[PDB]
């Protein structure tokens, strides 16, 4: 499982996995800690710039995150780690196999609740110690005392009291003495969320049936009841900017704002986050600010702001609706295709099953951006035909990019599922192009390629015809018809002289692009699935259906190397920039590196999840792969 | 932000400081009674003397104006300056001014109000500081010359941007442009807050309600095609209608009746909202004129209902409330008049309510059905429930008198109900 | 009247002058240690100086009525009655979606002079001056051709 050539570096494009993010304040500034699988990332609230990433991946997925000043606490399985600047400072290991569920830190006490309704209390060895390390005691909530623990909260001005919130009711535990000071009355509806109010002795409780309760612990009595029928509260938060506002997030993806003083609804933000991925998993007002930060399971983090009222008098009544301020995001589903945009390792192109194409930046996350799908006005002047309701383009099966003519005209070609034409994009503008390339033989697009000069685009149809368009004018120029089955690969040498094609019929066609002649035809034993052409060395490898990679020299039209060893279909493979190695991935959960000079496998890996794509950086420094699970892109460093 | 933009904000904050003579001439020139050349020459004692006499004349009309003589129109207010005041004092001054503009709102036709308000304009610069309250209280006088004078001396707030064209114009602002102010959602919230204060203070008067109603009614018409924007209007204006209905004043209630009726025609609502509307309409129904308009309103809303349960019986609490305010005799008179509006759906719901809850009025059902022609399905529903009554309730001379009435009119449809039910 | 009492707070005694933040709690410069009951009351006062107490918490509590209309507005977010249950279509708004063209499968060589849906079966009939009777199986997604019938020298006006 450990490679001798490659080592993991980090993941790209993932901002949050859906676990509620944590907010911490350093001085006047704020930062947000979000969970990304087995690692967490820290963003600056003012700019949403990545600051730190956890140094090492935790053995198990993180369940809870709490941050207080410089230190961050991350809980996974039965262990709670303490991190500062992304580097672990101390690991707390609980003495029971029950996994930690909830985490609370107030003063010198760290409270960790396991899924078996057991609360572990850790205390600071010394009052001046930065973080708690010493084990103080254990408090267990029995079924008679209350239901499953919903969350642990500490209210201000409470000496050594922990407000345990259970599904049935709320409990008040004295951590120093380990005794049950107070037990609240039972609530008819299951509690799902809790949030301490900026007022004293009052904690906001959210039920499963759209009811929010301002429970007062000192009086032990209800104070208010907001009703949101046919909804489920997922988050709660109060505005501390001097305005008595309450933001209620819902699993439906809606965020409602109430004016507590006036008993009215200010506004409702609809579908800020997807309902399929959990809606609004966390929505928190920044302390003393009108900015509210929202997150969800759709790999997105957003910020909204309340502008000042437009009325010189009665500003309380005339409340401006919240405005989108800034956000960070990525794919909501695993990427389907990836490609390196430039010779250097700055930008990567990604496409996912969520029908969105992204340009991800390795050097800085803030530079990552989504390419627009806004269509240009047609040159002829006729009205473009499509549904008025706007929908994203289908999933992208293939992509071809060149940078010879970037900024001059279109320089990307993409193929879409169950679609009879290929769409073009512009990397400089980061927007869909103005040309569309059709197969012209009633077949779907299976392969797309571009010449090095950036002038021609090649489209391979499922019916076997290869159509050649001009990228600048989008005018069909040539049409080659040799294959009778689908064309699964097209490539042209750097010199724009010899062109090579492959198809499911098993033949490899060699064409003279300039003279438009059939130089030769080569038949292979099994159908060909994919092609990668190395322009510098004039070698191209073909992934056959018999679980082999066949390397062929275009100059002489003969097989030079054949690679065996994969136990299942080869999902993807790529050449090394020097043209000396091939790294291939297959459905048998392995990535193998092959040394072409000796024609043998030199390295082997076992991936937990099947790698769907493999791509070398043109520099050779990095290897990027995508997996059947996970919304990000795994970047490996080339130790060679 | 450029330095000029920041300096622009500074200038607005210090608008009325009167730093130099040129600033004093601009500020002191603004007047509601005098031209600029004459106004600048005047003195506070001259202005205060005239205002004190005007307040006495207003005091005779209405005793409530006598209170400000102790606070705003005092001789000690001559030497009172707002710029030198602390924030608590300025807030406290604004409450007194806002109260005055409410009382003066209905007397702007009288000449003395223009002299009394000249003191506040000159002394307290309300046209610069309390500009929104002044505009709102005088909004229905837009065709009057007084509103023209106000526009000349006032700086329009952002929400009153449409009136900028008519500042210092020969033509008064057209009635069409007032729809545009009320068309905005932010302005409606502001006007709602102002109108709420009047209701709390019982300071509302008929001319205010009439102008407020027309602007609200027209705003619906302008948004009739846009169903999405109608939806955003429902939280605001129906909330206004609830406040108006709560007011004991009948004129406020009649305005609420007008507002609700237009909404139901403009946009179909849940029957739950319609039923809640009856609960508010009937809860505070005491005035006879309000009672007459309410019944027409109640009949109209049920006409708008177009979903299953359209003619289902009223809830138990709803029916009992309606009968107390409208006894059975009154509705018979309502049906008796030849010009009755279409109310078949309400009577169908009302008729089924009687059978469910009050058997003694079963005789009244016979009289009601003769007076009004109910639609084919509506008669079928009534027949269906009365059939259940025969199975459950003891047979009665009135009960059979209802069946034989249906025998006389469309005998065959009676069989179809019986064939489907027993 | 607090519903609960914690005795540990009466016995707890804390020093103020250790940490800088707690120093502001002192009533006098001489005092340096205070019991928990006085310590809590000082913390609550300091908490109020950071978060002033709003109106809704103190003076207000929830604990034929005129305010019925206001209450239902708070509960309901969508004020337009659902059109799925109602059988009568809206006056001015039409909910209409386009489907695949019927003649896409087998195009006609003339104008469609007449159309007719089969009374029960899911078939559509077309006719024109091309003299052909084409029957399509209208499903909304494919609309394949069931059959055709060319009538020589018989233009189809209807």
């Amino acid at each position: 499982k450990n490679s001798k050539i490659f080592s993991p570096f980090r993941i790209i494009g993932n901002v949050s996995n859906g676990v509620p993010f944590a907010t911490g304040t350093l001085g006047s500034t704020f930062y947000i800690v979000t969970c990304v699988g087995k690692t967490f990332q820290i963003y600056d609230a003012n700019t949403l710039h990545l600051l730190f990433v956890s140094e090492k991946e935790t053995p198990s997925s993180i369940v809870a995150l709490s941050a207080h000043f410089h230190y961050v606490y991350a809980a996974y399985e039965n262990k709670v780690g303490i991190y500062k600047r992304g580097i672990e400072e101390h690991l707390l290991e609980l003495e029971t196999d029950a996994n930690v569920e909830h985490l609370c830190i107030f003063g010198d006490y760290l409270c960790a609740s396991t899924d078996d309704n057991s609360i572990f209390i850790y205390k600071k060895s010394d009052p001046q110690d930065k973080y708690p390390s010493e084990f103080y005691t254990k408090l267990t909530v029995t079924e008679i005392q209350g239901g499953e623990i919903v969350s642990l909260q500490h209210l201000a001005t409470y000496l050594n009291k922990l407000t345990v919130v259970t599904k049935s009711n709320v409990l008040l535990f004295n951590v120093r003495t380990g005794k049950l000071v107070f037990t609240s009355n039972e609530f008819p509806d299951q509690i799902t969320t809790a949030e301490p109010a900026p007022v004293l002795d009052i904690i906001a409780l959210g039920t499963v049936t759209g009811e929010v309760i301002m429970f007062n612990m000192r009086k032990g009595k209800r104070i208010r009841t907001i009703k949101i029928p046919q909804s489920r509260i997922s988050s709660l938060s109060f505005r501390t900017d001097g305005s008595s506002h309450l933001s209620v997030g819902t699993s439906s993806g809606d965020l409602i704002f109430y004016d507590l003083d006036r008993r009215s609804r200010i506004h409702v933000l609809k579908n800020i986050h997807r309902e399929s991925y959990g809606g609004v998993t966390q929505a928190t007002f920044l302390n003393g600010q009108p900015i509210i930060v929202t997150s969800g399971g759709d790999n997105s983090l957003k910020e909204y702001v309340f502008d000042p009222s437009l009325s010189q008098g009665s500003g309380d009544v005339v409340v401006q609706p919240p405005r989108y301020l800034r956000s960070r995001g990525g794919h909501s589903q695993p990427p389907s295709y990836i490609a390196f945009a430039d010779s250097q390792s700055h930008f990567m192109l990604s496409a996912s099953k969520d029908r969105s194409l992204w340009s991800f930046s390795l050097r800085k996350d803030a530079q990552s951006q989504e390419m627009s799908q806004r269509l240009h006005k047609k040159q002829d002047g006729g009205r473009v035909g499509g549904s008025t309701i706007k929908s994203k383009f289908p999933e992208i099966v293939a992509l071809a990019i060149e940078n010879a003519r970037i900024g001059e005209w279109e320089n990307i070609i993409t193929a879409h599922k169950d679609e009879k034409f290929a769409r073009t994009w512009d990397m400089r503008n980061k927007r869909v192009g103005r040309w569309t390339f059709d197969t012209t033989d009633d077949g779907f697009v299976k392969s797309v390629a571009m010449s090095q000069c950036g002038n021609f685009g090649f489209i391979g149809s499922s019916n076997g015809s290869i159509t050649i368009y001009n990228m600048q004018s989008g005018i069909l120029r040539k049409k080659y018809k040799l294959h009778k089955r689908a064309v699964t690969g097209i490539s042209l040498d750097g010199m724009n002289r010899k062109m090579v094609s492959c198809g499911l019929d098993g033949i490899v066609g060699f064409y003279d692009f300039n003279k438009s002649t059939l130089l030769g035809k080569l038949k292979l034993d099994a159908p060909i699935t994919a092609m990668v052409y190395h322009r510098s060395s004039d070698l191209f490898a073909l992934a056959l259906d018999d679980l082999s990679i066949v390397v062929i020299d275009a100059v002489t039209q003969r097989v030079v190397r054949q690679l065996w060893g994969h136990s299942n279909r080869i999902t993807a493979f790529d050449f090394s920039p020097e043209g000396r190695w091939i790294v291939s991935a297959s459905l048998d959960s392995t990535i193998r590196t092959w040394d072409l000079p000796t024609g043998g496998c030199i390295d082997g890996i076992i991936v937990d999840n099947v790698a769907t794509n493999v791509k070398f950086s043109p520099n050779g420094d990095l290897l990027a792969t995508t997996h059947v699970t996970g919304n990000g892109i795994c970047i490996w460093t080339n130790r060679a | 932000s450029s330095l000029s933009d920041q300096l622009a904000q500074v200038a607005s904050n210090n608008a009325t400081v009167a730093l130099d003579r040129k600033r004093r001439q601009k500020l002191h020139s603004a007047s509601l009674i005098y031209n600029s050349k004459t106004a600048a020459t005047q003195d506070y004692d001259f202005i205060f003397e005239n205002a004190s006499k005007a307040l006495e004349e207003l005091s005779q009309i209405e005793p409530k104006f006598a209170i400000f003589s102790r606070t705003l129109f005092s001789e000690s207010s001559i030497s009172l300056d707002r710029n030198v005041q602390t924030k608590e004092e300025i807030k406290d001054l604004d409450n007194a001014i806002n109260a005055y503009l409410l009382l003066a709102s209905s007397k702007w036709y009288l000449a003395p109000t223009l002299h009394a308000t000249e003191w506040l304009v000159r002394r307290f610069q309300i046209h610069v500081k309390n500009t929104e309250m002044l505009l709102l209280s005088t909004l229905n006088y837009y065709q009057t010359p007084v509103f023209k004078r106000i526009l000349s001396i006032i700086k329009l707030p952002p929400l009153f941007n449409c009136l900028s064209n008519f500042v210092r114009s020969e033509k008064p602002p057209t009635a069409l442009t007032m729809i545009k102010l009320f068309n905005d959602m932010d302005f409606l919230k502001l006007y709602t807050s102002y109108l709420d204060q009047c209701i709390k203070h019982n300071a509302t008067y008929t001319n205010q309600l009439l102008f407020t109603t027309c602007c609200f009614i027209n705003v619906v018409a302008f948004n009739s095609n846009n169903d999405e924007k109608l939806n955003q209007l429902v939280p605001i204006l129906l909330e206004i209608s609830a406040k108006l209905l709560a007011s004991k004043s009948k004129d406020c209630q009649i305005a609420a009746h007008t507002i609700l009726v237009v909404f139901a025609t403009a946009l179909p609502l849940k029957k739950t909202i319609i039923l809640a509307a009856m609960e508010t309409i009937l809860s505070n129904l005491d005035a006879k004129e309000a009672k007459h308009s309410a019944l027409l309103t109640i009949c109209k809303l049920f006409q708008t209902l177009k979903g299953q349960g359209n003619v289902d019986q009223l809830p138990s609490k709803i029916f009992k409330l309606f009968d107390s305010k409208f006894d059975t005799v009154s509705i018979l008179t309502f049906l008796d008049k030849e010009d009755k509006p279409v109310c078949d759906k309400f009577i169908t719901s009302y008729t089924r309510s009687i059978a469910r809850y009050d058997r003694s009025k079963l005789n009244i059902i016979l009289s009601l059905l003769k007076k009004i022609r109910l639609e084919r399905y509506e008669v079928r529903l009534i027949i269906t429930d009365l059939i259940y009554l025969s199975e459950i309730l003891e047979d009665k001379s009135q009960l059979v008198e209802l069946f034989e009435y249906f025998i006389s009119i469309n005998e065959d449809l009676v069989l179809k109900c019986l064939k489907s039910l027993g | 009247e607090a519903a609960w009492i914690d005795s540990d707070d009466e016995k707890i005694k804390v020093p103020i002058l250790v940490t800088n933040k707690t120093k502001k709690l002192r009533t006098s410069y001489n005092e340096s240690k205070i019991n928990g009951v006085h310590y809590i009351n000082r913390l609550r006062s300091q908490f109020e100086k950071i978060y002033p107490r709003p109106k809704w918490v103190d003076d207000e509590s929830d604990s034929g009525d005129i305010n019925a209309l206001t209450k239902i507005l708070s509960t309901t977010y969508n004020y337009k009655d659902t059109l799925s249950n109602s059988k009568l279509l809206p006056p001015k708004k039409l909910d209409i979606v386009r489907l695949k063209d019927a003649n896409a499968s087998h195009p006609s060589h003339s104008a469609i002079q007449s159309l007719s849906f089969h009374p029960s079966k899911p078939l559509l009939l077309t006719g024109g001056y091309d003299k052909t009777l084409r029957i399509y199986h209208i499903d909304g997604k494919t609309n394949h051709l069931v059959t055709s019938l060319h009538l020589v020298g018989s233009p189809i006006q209807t």
């Binding site: 201000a156 050594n160 003393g288 600010q289 | - | -």
Partner: peptide, 27 residues
């Protein structure tokens, strides 16, 4: 002219927060 709706620039302002460290006490 209709009402102008500009989105003005917003820059964060420091705010005081209650520190929970005062709550803990030792006997």
């Amino acid at each position: 002219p209709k009402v102008v709706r500009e989105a003005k620039k917003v820059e964060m302002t420091e705010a005081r927060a209650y520190n929970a460290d005062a709550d803990t006490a030792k006997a």
